[PDB]
Design a binder for this molecule. Structure first.
Ligand SMILES: *[C@@H]1O[C@H](CO)[C@@H](O[C@@H]2O[C@H](CO)[C@@H](O[C@@H]3O[C@H](CO[C@H]4O[C@H](CO)[C@@H](O)[C@H](O)[C@@H]4O)[C@@H](O)[C@H](O[C@H]4O[C@H](CO)[C@@H](O)[C@H](O)[C@@H]4O)[C@@H]3O)[C@H](O)[C@H]2NC(C)=O)[C@H](O)[C@H]1NC(C)=O
Ligand SMILES: *[C@@H]1O[C@H](CO)[C@@H](O[C@@H]2O[C@H](CO)[C@@H](O[C@@H]3O[C@H](CO[C@H]4O[C@H](CO)[C@@H](O)[C@H](O)[C@@H]4O)[C@@H](O)[C@H](O[C@H]4O[C@H](CO)[C@@H](O)[C@H](O)[C@@H]4O)[C@@H]3O)[C@H](O)[C@H]2NC(C)=O)[C@H](O)[C@H]1NC(C)=O
Ligand SMILES: *[C@@H]1O[C@H](CO)[C@@H](O[C@@H]2O[C@H](CO)[C@@H](O[C@@H]3O[C@H](CO[C@H]4O[C@H](CO)[C@@H](O)[C@H](O)[C@@H]4O)[C@@H](O)[C@H](O[C@H]4O[C@H](CO)[C@@H](O)[C@H](O)[C@@H]4O)[C@@H]3O)[C@H](O)[C@H]2NC(C)=O)[C@H](O)[C@H]1NC(C)=O
Ligand SMILES: *[C@@H]1O[C@H](CO[C@@H]2O[C@@H](C)[C@@H](O)[C@@H](O)[C@@H]2O)[C@@H](O[C@@H]2O[C@H](CO)[C@@H](O[C@@H]3O[C@H](CO)[C@@H](O)[C@H](O[C@H]4O[C@H](CO)[C@@H](O)[C@H](O)[C@@H]4O)[C@@H]3O)[C@H](O)[C@H]2NC(C)=O)[C@H](O)[C@H]1NC(C)=O
Ligand SMILES: *[C@@H]1O[C@H](CO)[C@@H](O[C@@H]2O[C@H](CO)[C@@H](O[C@@H]3O[C@H](CO)[C@@H](O)[C@H](O)[C@@H]3O)[C@H](O)[C@H]2NC(C)=O)[C@H](O)[C@H]1NC(C)=O
Ligand SMILES: *[C@@H]1O[C@H](CO)[C@@H](O[C@@H]2O[C@H](CO)[C@@H](O)[C@H](O)[C@H]2NC(C)=O)[C@H](O)[C@H]1NC(C)=O
Ligand SMILES: *[C@@H]1O[C@H](CO)[C@@H](O)[C@H](O)[C@H]1NC(C)=O
Ligand SMILES: *[C@@H]1O[C@H](CO)[C@@H](O)[C@H](O)[C@H]1NC(C)=O
Ligand SMILES: *[C@@H]1O[C@H](CO)[C@@H](O)[C@H](O)[C@H]1NC(C)=O
Lengths: 49, 99, 198, 49, 50
């Protein structure tokens, strides 16, 4: 689970068309995380996923 | 492959590039074992923050889902990540998102 | 005299001409019956568009003793032969003379006034909704961005595949998400200028 | 009771978006893309519903 | 055949064009006397098992 206390400034809802200006909704979204990499160096060597 | 009005070969693909040099004109090269064609889709937006790619071929930019493709299996990433470039690295975080 | 406004995603002038040509004769076999009929899509049996802007063109080459052949079209797809030149937006577009999966059939009939009419051929369209393909009646010359509009007047607008009638105005709002905003009435009231953010 | 009386108006807009066995819910969209006959039949269905 | 639906098979050899090999027609009626199993049952006197 994602920890609480995040502004989520660089995050947006996954929408095919249009966007909800304000409100609430429940849907399946890509939120569960297995691993996180930050301040990276290795992808400059042709990293493969 | 994206270039700022510097297209030694993409200019042949798109003779009337238009606009000016400041905006970046991006292209998708359809490389395969039969042809190496270059396609133009859109011009670089001034600001890009979050980019999402799905396993089913759907790409999402700024929560739009600009393009959709077929089945995907792997990907390769390269830039100037020469150890000391992480300070001005263009990637903040990369994660394995799940539905 | 409603002004016309057309705005889509910013792109340069990438125009192509797709042509369907039909050639047949009627005055040789029986007058009311054909001899040979050939249909070519730019000299080929099938084609697929690639450029953002494309223009359809249909050409008739019919020979008969009477000299007059009535042309009729049987339509099953949501768009007709001439309606495609009305600022239509798509993602994938392919045309063929042979059967293809998930493709509707459009029929062309010729009546040489001899008493009997015949179907020349059948057309198959494989089309997907989207934005990367635009259908314009004529090419745009000396145009860097196809989008053009008029502000603060009543006008017939076609924005992002939705056509309506109204007055368009500029608002001093800032938003970093989406390209258009809709209400619970299906009306696309708010849209953003992607190049400028307005 | 105040929320009960303030309700029962929002759903009136909802069924406008609903499509009654027609190509699209926008009458202007349908009228300018397909022949007058079937478009008239479909808009008759829409107005009746 | 009368009162028979059509099932189509399409082959795309990746050369750019795909073609339909043929069409299949099935004349079927609801009932009990015909059963479709993924595999045959070996050494079974009564197919019913639960
Ligand atoms: C925007 O528009 C796009 C279309 O471009 C939509 O994308 C579709 O999203 C749905 C939802 O995920 C996709 O459906 C998925 O298909 C998977 C592939 O199916 C195979 O596997 C199933 C068995 O699960 C077989 O029966 C089938 O024959 C295929 O062989 C399914 O597997 C998915 O179901 C399961 O997924 C995982 C797999 O383990 C499970 O964890 C799940 O719980 C679930 O059981 C799922 O049904 C669909 O393929 C997408 N289409 C395309 C073209 O990409 C977007 O949904 C739409 N909306 C948004 C917000 O983007
Ligand atoms: C698919 O279909 C399109 C539409 O018909 C075809 O484009 C037309 O091509 C024909 C010739 O094949 C053009 O007819 C003549 O073309 C000459 C040279 O063409 C160039 O210049 C014209 C403008 O003059 C451009 O439109 C064209 O794209 C070329 O850049 C012209 O010199 C001729 O001009 C004469 O007629 C005009 C009109 O009467 C006069 O004003 C002139 O003074 C002169 O007398 C003539 O136009 C035709 O113009 C093309 N139309 C368009 C819209 O492009 C494609 O060729 C066809 N492609 C395939 C593969 O089938
Ligand atoms: C909001 O939506 C609108 C809808 O199109 C878009 O507006 C863009 O930004 C400006 C706003 O008008 C426009 O582009 C600019 O045009 C200027 C003037 O154009 C010509 O004007 C006369 C003819 O009347 C010519 O003689 C003159 O030479 C201009 O070419 C230009 O000054 C701008 O750059 C031009 O000059 C430089 C000088 O070096 C050249 O290098 C350039 O190639 C170019 O010729 C500029 O082109 C136009 O309306 C839109 N421009 C686009 C889409 O590129 C935008 O989508 C959005 N608004 C903004 C501000 O983004
Ligand atoms: C309208 O259509 C006619 C009919 O031509 C053809 O009709 C169908 C059978 C079908 O194949 C169509 O696709 C095709 O248009 C056009 O009239 C002639 O069209 C042919 C094209 O097939 C032109 O080229 C010819 O090609 C033949 C195959 O190689 C060749 O044998 C021909 O040579 C012979 O031509 C005549 C018979 O037409 C014969 O009398 C001669 O002695 C010679 O052997 C020829 O190279 C022709 O140039 C077209 N014109 C003539 C007069 O034949 C027509 O051009 C087209 N467009 C119009 C009317 O605007
Ligand atoms: C994300 O991108 C920004 C934008 O480039 C990065 O900011 C950059 O950070 C580096 C080092 O922190 C700056 O280099 C140093 O700047 C100071 C002045 O602050 C200067 O005195 C030094 O000599 C050295 O040049 C760089 O200037 C700065 N960029 C800008 C435009 O100011 C940021 O580091 C990136 N973050 C990650 C995690 O990569
Ligand atoms: C890909 O398909 C095309 C046509 O079926 C073929 O590619 C050609 O390959 C030769 C030899 O490598 C080149 O000289 C040609 O230039 C290629 N064609 C094109 C259009 O570029 C070949 O059959 C296939 N190539 C594979 C399977 O590797
Ligand atoms: C990644 O790109 C750099 C360009 O500077 C190149 O030197 C390097 O060989 C590339 N890595 C791979 C694995 O191709
Ligand atoms: C893009 O512009 C930069 C200047 O900021 C320049 O150094 C670079 O060479 C340009 N891109 C290409 C492909 O030339
Ligand atoms: C937006 O800015 C102010 C309020 O923020 C307002 O007075 C002004 O008239 C608006 N400008 C527009 C709508 O162009």
């Amino acid at each position: 689970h994602i920890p609480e206390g995040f502004s989520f400034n660089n995050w947006f809802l996954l929408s095919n068309d249009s966007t909800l200006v304000h409100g609430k909704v429940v849907s399946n979204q890509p939120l569960l995380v297995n691993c996180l990499l930050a301040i990276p160096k290795i992808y400059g060597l042709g990293q493969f996923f | 492959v994206c270039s700022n009005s510097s297209n030694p070969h993409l200019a042949t693909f798109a003779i009337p590039l238009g606009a000016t040099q400041v905006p970046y004109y991006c292209f998708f090269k359809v490389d395969t074992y039969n042809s190496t064609v270059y396609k133009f889709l859109a011009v670089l937006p001034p600001t890009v923050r979050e980019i999402v790619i799905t396993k089913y071929g759907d790409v999402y930019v700024n929560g739009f889902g600009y393009l959709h493709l077929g089945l995907l299996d792997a990907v390769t990433i390269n830039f100037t990540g020469h150890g000391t470039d992480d300070d001005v690295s263009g990637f903040w975080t990369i994660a394995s998102t799940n539905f | 005299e409603q002004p016309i406004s057309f705005v889509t995603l910013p792109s340069f002038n990438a125009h192509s001409f797709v042509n369907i040509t039909v050639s047949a004769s009627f005055g040789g076999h029986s007058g009311a019956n054909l001899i040979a009929s050939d249909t070519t899509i730019n000299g080929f049996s099938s084609f697929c568009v690639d450029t953002r802007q494309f223009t359809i063109s249909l050409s008739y080459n019919v020979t008969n003793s009477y000299g007059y052949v009535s042309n009729s079209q049987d339509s099953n797809c949501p768009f007709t032969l001439q309606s495609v030149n009305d600022y239509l937006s798509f993602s994938k577009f392919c045309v063929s003379t042979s059967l293809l999966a998930s493709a509707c059939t459009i029929d062309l009939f010729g009546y040489p006034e001899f008493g009997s009419g015949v179907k020349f051929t059948s057309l198959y369209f494989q089309f997907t909704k989207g934005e990367l393909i635009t259908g314009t009646p004529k090419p745009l010359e000396g145009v860097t961005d196809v989008s053009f509009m008029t502000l603060d007047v009543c006008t017939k607008y076609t924005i992002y595949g939705f056509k309506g009638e109204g007055i368009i105005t500029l608002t001093n709002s800032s938003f970093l998400a989406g390209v258009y905003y809709t209400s619970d009435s299906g009306q696309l009231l708010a849209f953003k200028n992607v190049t400028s953010g307005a | 009771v105040v929320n009960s009386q303030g309700a029962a108006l929002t759903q009136l807009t909802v069924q406008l978006q609903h499509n009654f066995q027609a190509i699209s819910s926008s009458i202007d969209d349908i009228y300018s893309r397909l022949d007058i006959l079937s478009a008239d039949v479909q808009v008759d269905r829409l107005i009746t519903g």
